[PDB]
Design a protein around this ligand. Structure first.
Ligand code: 0OW
Ligand code: NMN
Length: 313
């Protein structure tokens, strides 16, 4: 049959190939091959892994199912803190924000606009391309180490394109439909339902048994790089492209707005588009695009001065 020498090599080929399909299907939401092509190879790999468990690696797709069970979560400090967002609620709130930015900067400023995803903020640290820590925001300077649980989030890469060392932050959420499904499953089990998708997302990520988490149907959008490493983005918009480039899920709805008035267009555009989305959002995030300018404005103690969230009512 298959020898260890042969299986060791064949396994790499399968992880490589399978991980490629999973990337397309989970990160680009656009698969290339038919499901049964995937399953065939995935079953070949499992058979190889079951015969020689020693070839099992963290970047293998068979580990997306979890199995580990923790006692509790370890503290996960953030040397670079995970800030919060200042809030706006009116057109006045947004336009006053813009007024403040031009006052301190002394010129017109371009805004990257992103949809504020209603879920759990997460931070992801990679070294030489390997995923080594996943963390909640916690209180901004200390979160919880939820690395095991995030191994089961399919859109989170166990290994990157480039062997690059970087930490990136974004949202982990449950799409509306998985929300509904989970709640029905919970009704059937006679438990309390989750009031909303962000609560489901947050309880899922606090489950100690990673095998339950795997089943939960979670997804990510990455939007900030905390530790650039060799990374080269110089504006936020640029950063969002470069996050895709190295292989994270980014939300496609982000725009680049050269005026506050366009910013108010965007907020309206997706305020009416809000229900048409598979995921829930609780507003819009407006960011000063130029990193050089985000720097100049800098940070209050809570939230950055170069950004603000327009929250829907
Ligand atoms: N939820 C979001 O969609 C979102 C976003 N697209 N972009 C940011 O940029 C923050 C990062 C630190 C300074 C500004 N924050 C977001 O949500 C924050 C994360 C933690 C508190 C808010 O939920
Ligand atoms: N490229 C693809 O078509 C592709 C990739 C990953 C998962 N899937 C599908 O997702 C389901 C679960 O697979 P995984 O738990 O290994 O991610 C399976 O039914 C599989 O067919 C399809």
């Amino acid at each position: 049959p298959l020898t260890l020498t042969a299986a060791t090599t064949r396994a790499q080929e399968l992880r490589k190939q399978l991980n490629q399909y999973s990337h397309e299907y989970y990160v680009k939401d656009q698969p290339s091959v038919e499901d049964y092509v995937y399953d065939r190879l995935y079953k070949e790999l499992v058979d190889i892994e079951t015969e020689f468990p020693d070839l099992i690696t963290p970047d293998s797709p068979t580990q997306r199912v979890g199995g580990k069970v923790l006692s509790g979560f370890e503290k996960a400090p953030h040397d670079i803190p995970m800030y919060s967002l200042n809030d706006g609620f009116s057109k006045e709130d947004i336009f006053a924000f813009d007024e403040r930015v031009r006052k301190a900067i002394g010129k017109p400023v371009a805004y990257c606009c992103e949809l504020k995803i209603d879920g759990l903020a997460i931070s992801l640290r990679y070294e030489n391309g390997v995923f080594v820590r996943g963390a909640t925001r916690g209180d901004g300077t200390v979160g919880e180490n939820i690395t095991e649980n995030l191994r089961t989030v399919r859109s989170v890469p166990m290994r990157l394109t480039e062997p690059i060392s970087v930490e990136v932050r974004g949202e982990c959420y449950m799409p509306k439909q998985s929300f509904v499904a989970l709640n029905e499953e919970r009704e059937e089990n006679g438990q309390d339902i989750f009031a909303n998708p962000r609560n489901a997302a947050a309880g899922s990520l606090r489950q100690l048994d990673t095998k339950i988490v795997a089943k939960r149907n979670l997804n990510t959008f990455l939007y900030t790089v905390a530790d650039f490493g060799p990374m080269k983005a110089k504006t936020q918009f640029e950063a969002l492209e470069e996050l895709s480039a190295i292989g994270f899920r980014t939300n496609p709805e982000r725009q680049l707005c050269q005026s506050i008035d366009e910013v108010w267009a965007y907020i309206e555009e997706y305020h009416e588009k809000r229900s048409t989305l598979p995921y829930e959002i609780d507003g819009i995030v407006i960011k000063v695009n130029e990193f050089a300018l985000q720097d100049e404005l800098g940070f209050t103690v809570k939230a950055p001065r170069w950004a603000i969230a327009y929250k829907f009512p």
